[PDB]
Design a protein around this ligand. Structure first.
Ligand SMILES: [Co+2]
Ligand SMILES: [Co+2]
Ligand SMILES: [Co+2]
Ligand SMILES: [Co+2]
Length: 144
């Protein structure tokens, strides 16, 4: 089915080390990223963010009393040519809203959508990712 061109990005990082959790995509194994996901019909961006965090890295934010922060930033970017097939005909732009999630410590991650995970210092995570928006979010909200 078609992916929706409205998405969320959740930058996950550990408060004590400031390392950033990066996840290896299955459709593009060269693409490491923070948690991203489409906003589905009838849900809000924060709902989608909490849902994708539960689905993709098995972290439940309500139960753990963690705090999902809305970064109050939205960007729009061109969908990678090789991934665009997943969107409806004529759709080439994706609009992405940013969130930040601070864990108290690095931890062991069980993932579902990805091939592997790594904890990296923020500059390295930032340089590693293929997504300019993911990079920018790490730079502005982890590094400062
Ligand atoms: Co995703
Ligand atoms: Co999704
Ligand atoms: Co997902
Ligand atoms: Co999905």
């Amino acid at each position: 089915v078609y992916k929706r061109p409205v998405s969320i990005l959740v930058v996950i990082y550990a408060q004590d080390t400031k390392r950033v959790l990066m996840l290896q995509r299955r459709d593009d194994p060269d693409f490491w990223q923070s948690v991203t996901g489409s906003v589905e019909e009838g849900e809000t961006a924060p709902q989608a963010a909490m849902r994708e965090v539960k689905e993709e890295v098995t972290i439940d934010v309500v139960a753990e009393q963690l705090t999902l922060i809305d970064c109050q930033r939205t960007v729009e970017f061109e969908i990678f040519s090789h991934l665009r097939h997943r969107y409806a005909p004529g759709v080439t732009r994706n609009t992405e809203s940013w969130f930040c999630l601070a864990l108290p410590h690095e931890r062991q991650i069980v993932f579902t959508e990805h091939l592997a995970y790594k904890w990296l210092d923020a500059p390295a995570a930032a340089a590693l990712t293929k997504s300019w928006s993911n990079r920018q979010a790490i730079e502005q909200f982890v590094i400062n």
